[PDB]
PDB file of C-alpha atoms in Angstrom:
ATOM      1  CA  UNK A  28       0.000   0.000   0.000  1.00  0.00           C
ATOM      2  CA  UNK A  29       0.987   3.647   0.266  1.00  0.00           C
ATOM      3  CA  UNK A  30       1.397   4.897   3.834  1.00  0.00           C
ATOM      4  CA  UNK A  31       1.345   8.715   3.452  1.00  0.00           C
ATOM      5  CA  UNK A  32       2.748   9.573   6.884  1.00  0.00           C
ATOM      6  CA  UNK A  33       4.634  12.364   5.147  1.00  0.00           C
ATOM      7  CA  UNK A  34       5.220  13.927   1.714  1.00  0.00           C
ATOM      8  CA  UNK A  35       1.951  15.661   0.884  1.00  0.00           C
ATOM      9  CA  UNK A  36       0.919  18.185  -1.740  1.00  0.00           C
ATOM     10  CA  UNK A  37       1.270  21.343   0.330  1.00  0.00           C
ATOM     11  CA  UNK A  38      -1.773  23.494  -0.460  1.00  0.00           C
ATOM     12  CA  UNK A  39      -3.466  21.891  -3.456  1.00  0.00           C
ATOM     13  CA  UNK A  40      -6.771  23.738  -3.511  1.00  0.00           C
ATOM     14  CA  UNK A  41     -10.057  24.051  -1.659  1.00  0.00           C
ATOM     15  CA  UNK A  42     -13.510  23.185  -2.938  1.00  0.00           C
ATOM     16  CA  UNK A  43     -15.007  25.488  -0.330  1.00  0.00           C
ATOM     17  CA  UNK A  44     -14.029  29.151  -0.099  1.00  0.00           C
ATOM     18  CA  UNK A  45     -16.708  30.198   2.392  1.00  0.00           C
ATOM     19  CA  UNK A  46     -14.902  31.914   5.330  1.00  0.00           C
ATOM     20  CA  UNK A  47     -17.006  30.889   8.353  1.00  0.00           C
ATOM     21  CA  UNK A  48     -20.690  31.441   7.582  1.00  0.00           C
ATOM     22  CA  UNK A  49     -23.991  29.894   8.759  1.00  0.00           C
ATOM     23  CA  UNK A  50     -22.434  29.645  12.249  1.00  0.00           C
ATOM     24  CA  UNK A  51     -20.710  26.551  13.643  1.00  0.00           C
ATOM     25  CA  UNK A  52     -22.036  22.995  13.502  1.00  0.00           C
ATOM     26  CA  UNK A  53     -20.438  22.128  16.874  1.00  0.00           C
ATOM     27  CA  UNK A  54     -18.154  19.578  15.247  1.00  0.00           C
ATOM     28  CA  UNK A  55     -16.145  20.784  12.257  1.00  0.00           C
ATOM     29  CA  UNK A  56     -13.431  19.634   9.882  1.00  0.00           C
ATOM     30  CA  UNK A  57     -10.461  21.817   9.015  1.00  0.00           C
ATOM     31  CA  UNK A  58      -9.389  22.705   5.495  1.00  0.00           C
ATOM     32  CA  UNK A  59      -6.072  21.081   6.373  1.00  0.00           C
ATOM     33  CA  UNK A  60      -7.671  17.641   6.672  1.00  0.00           C
ATOM     34  CA  UNK A  61     -10.027  18.341   3.770  1.00  0.00           C
ATOM     35  CA  UNK A  62      -7.093  19.206   1.503  1.00  0.00           C
ATOM     36  CA  UNK A  63      -5.196  16.041   2.442  1.00  0.00           C
ATOM     37  CA  UNK A  64      -8.304  13.903   1.978  1.00  0.00           C
ATOM     38  CA  UNK A  65      -9.086  15.407  -1.429  1.00  0.00           C
ATOM     39  CA  UNK A  66      -5.464  15.224  -2.545  1.00  0.00           C
ATOM     40  CA  UNK A  67      -5.087  11.588  -1.507  1.00  0.00           C
ATOM     41  CA  UNK A  68      -8.389  10.691  -3.154  1.00  0.00           C
ATOM     42  CA  UNK A  69      -7.096  12.279  -6.358  1.00  0.00           C
ATOM     43  CA  UNK A  70      -3.556  10.853  -6.198  1.00  0.00           C
ATOM     44  CA  UNK A  71      -4.642   7.381  -5.097  1.00  0.00           C
ATOM     45  CA  UNK A  72      -7.799   5.415  -5.865  1.00  0.00           C
ATOM     46  CA  UNK A  73      -9.317   5.508  -2.372  1.00  0.00           C
ATOM     47  CA  UNK A  74      -8.525   4.662   1.240  1.00  0.00           C
ATOM     48  CA  UNK A  75      -7.678   1.023   1.735  1.00  0.00           C
ATOM     49  CA  UNK A  76      -8.320  -0.967   4.895  1.00  0.00           C
ATOM     50  CA  UNK A  77      -4.850  -0.142   6.169  1.00  0.00           C
ATOM     51  CA  UNK A  78      -4.783   3.441   4.872  1.00  0.00           C
ATOM     52  CA  UNK A  79      -7.741   4.396   7.077  1.00  0.00           C
ATOM     53  CA  UNK A  80      -5.786   3.319  10.186  1.00  0.00           C
ATOM     54  CA  UNK A  81      -2.715   5.244   8.989  1.00  0.00           C
ATOM     55  CA  UNK A  82      -4.826   8.332   8.391  1.00  0.00           C
ATOM     56  CA  UNK A  83      -6.437   7.875  11.790  1.00  0.00           C
ATOM     57  CA  UNK A  84      -3.033   7.918  13.481  1.00  0.00           C
ATOM     58  CA  UNK A  85      -1.933  10.990  11.531  1.00  0.00           C
ATOM     59  CA  UNK A  86      -4.966  13.147  12.268  1.00  0.00           C
ATOM     60  CA  UNK A  87      -5.080  11.916  15.876  1.00  0.00           C
ATOM     61  CA  UNK A  88      -8.548  10.529  15.183  1.00  0.00           C
ATOM     62  CA  UNK A  89     -10.136   7.144  15.727  1.00  0.00           C
ATOM     63  CA  UNK A  90     -10.110   4.234  13.284  1.00  0.00           C
ATOM     64  CA  UNK A  91     -13.826   3.957  14.009  1.00  0.00           C
ATOM     65  CA  UNK A  92     -14.285   7.582  12.991  1.00  0.00           C
ATOM     66  CA  UNK A  93     -12.083   7.440   9.886  1.00  0.00           C
ATOM     67  CA  UNK A  94     -13.788   4.284   8.623  1.00  0.00           C
ATOM     68  CA  UNK A  95     -17.284   5.629   9.244  1.00  0.00           C
ATOM     69  CA  UNK A  96     -16.584   8.932   7.477  1.00  0.00           C
ATOM     70  CA  UNK A  97     -15.292   7.073   4.427  1.00  0.00           C
ATOM     71  CA  UNK A  98     -18.182   4.589   4.315  1.00  0.00           C
ATOM     72  CA  UNK A  99     -20.734   7.388   4.712  1.00  0.00           C
ATOM     73  CA  UNK A 100     -19.279   9.353   1.805  1.00  0.00           C
ATOM     74  CA  UNK A 101     -19.078   6.029  -0.006  1.00  0.00           C
ATOM     75  CA  UNK A 102     -22.669   4.887   0.592  1.00  0.00           C
ATOM     76  CA  UNK A 103     -24.200   8.324  -0.101  1.00  0.00           C
ATOM     77  CA  UNK A 104     -24.002   7.600  -3.831  1.00  0.00           C
ATOM     78  CA  UNK A 105     -26.225   4.544  -3.472  1.00  0.00           C
ATOM     79  CA  UNK A 106     -28.581   5.600  -0.693  1.00  0.00           C
ATOM     80  CA  UNK A 107     -27.992   9.048   0.806  1.00  0.00           C
ATOM     81  CA  UNK A 108     -25.701  10.801   3.291  1.00  0.00           C
ATOM     82  CA  UNK A 109     -26.799  10.663   6.925  1.00  0.00           C
ATOM     83  CA  UNK A 110     -25.595  12.721   9.892  1.00  0.00           C
ATOM     84  CA  UNK A 111     -27.180  10.451  12.505  1.00  0.00           C
TER      85      UNK A 111
END
């Protein structure tokens, strides 16, 4: 696999350029993570079973969280995205 613990594309681009509007949704994702996610999804095919645990360690998040985020964005194409 590819374990991207380092060597990223420093500042690729952002899909969102909306500087803090509509208030805060309590929990939020940073453009830093978003950029890395989008870059890696463009450079690679997707996140593999191992890659999600790597990513989890890098962003100091949980494997349960990283997997669920991916599967939600994955399944939205077939069913729909859910916040729960």
